[PDB]
Ligand binder design. Structure first.
Ligand code: HEM
Length: 291
């Protein structure tokens, strides 16, 4: 199975910048969502979940086909809560019907990271919607109740190595767990709608207590009111992961650089870009445009 990127016919950088801008303007407007967190975090999670179904062995799943629009994937228990992100993007898709679903969902995540003062993430167009029978079965996204070995094995299916895994997980500074979605409750830190290296600082510096939550699942809770999933906490239990956590806690700029690469890689897994395709786009923030 090969998925060749095909640029939406007649579109160029400036067209996609307009879509970016619409997402960013709506992010600015809808600031009350989820007790004033806004939609940034859920859009990042959406972009990751539409990408994280990829299987490197047969090129099934991944962002290319936009298959989250189909009920089997939309209703995956692992995706509970992401419907909020999909509903946010609906008026954007109405305004720009020419964009593919996979391009829109992935672009929502790039837009969110940048508008939350995160790193620039280069982004490529050309994902093409595929039919309902190409939707991956449920069960391809990761469990939270597991250890470092599970995390490492899981992410190898996505061709992610240790540095990429640790960098990607820093997105857990954003937003929060919600008991009704996932059976976990609480934020990873204080700055949960501005992109920073707080996740790593908190892993290393907080006084964590293992507890059961109200859904009877184990999570690690701090005196400050923060939480870590067992899979988050595993990054300071495994010696290889711990070394990289310390690196990112000490150097936010290095984290930003590594996250940007890893996140682009995640969003592009499964896609073959013709050697003549446009170079990756780097979108201007609203602030950079005076908008
Ligand atoms: C071992 C891998 C991972 C596991 C087990 C995991 C698990 C979870 C869980 C259980 C939630 C809470 C969902 C809810 O209750 O609403 C969550 C939220 C979130 N995840 Fe992950 N995740 C993983 C990796 C990632 C990656 C790679 C990213 C993106 C780079 C990511 C981004 C996010 C974001 C931004 C939220 C906050 C969503 C919100 O506030 O609505 N996660 N994750």
């Amino acid at each position: 199975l090969v998925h060749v990127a095909s640029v939406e016919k007649g579109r160029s950088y400036e067209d996609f910048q307009k879509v970016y801008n619409a997402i960013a303007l709506k992010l600015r407007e809808d600031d009350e969502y989820d007790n004033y967190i806004g939609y940034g975090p859920v859009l990042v999670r959406l972009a990751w979940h539409i990408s994280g179904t990829w299987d490197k062995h047969d090129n099934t799943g991944g962002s290319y086909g936009g298959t989250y629009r189909f009920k089997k994937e939309f209703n995956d228990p692992s995706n509970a809560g992401l419907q909020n992100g999909f509903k946010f993007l609906e008026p954007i898709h109405k305004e720009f019907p020419w964009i593919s679903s996979g391009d829109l969902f992935s672009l929502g995540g790039v837009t969110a990271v940048q508008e939350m003062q995160g790193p620039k993430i280069p982004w490529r167009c050309g994902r093409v919607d595929t039919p309902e029978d190409t939707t991956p079965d449920n069960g391809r996204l990761p469990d939270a109740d597991k250890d470092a070995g599970y995390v490492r094995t899981f992410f190898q299916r996505l061709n992610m190595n240790d540095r990429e895994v640790v960098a990607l997980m820093g997105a857990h500074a954003l937003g929060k767990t919600h008991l009704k979605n996932s059976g976990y409750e609480g934020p990873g830190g204080a700055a949960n709608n501005v992109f920073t290296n707080e996740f790593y600082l908190n892993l290393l510096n907080e006084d964590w207590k293992l507890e059961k939550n109200d859904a009877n699942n184990e999570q690690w809770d701090s005196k400050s009111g923060y939480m870590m999933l067992p899979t988050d906490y595993s990054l300071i239990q495994d010696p290889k992961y711990l070394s990289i956590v310390k690196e990112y806690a000490n150097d936010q700029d290095k984290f930003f650089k590594d996250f940007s690469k890893a996140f682009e890689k995640l969003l592009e897994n499964g896609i073959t870009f013709p050697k003549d395709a446009p170079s990756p786009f780097i979108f201007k923030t609203l602030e950079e445009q005076g908008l």
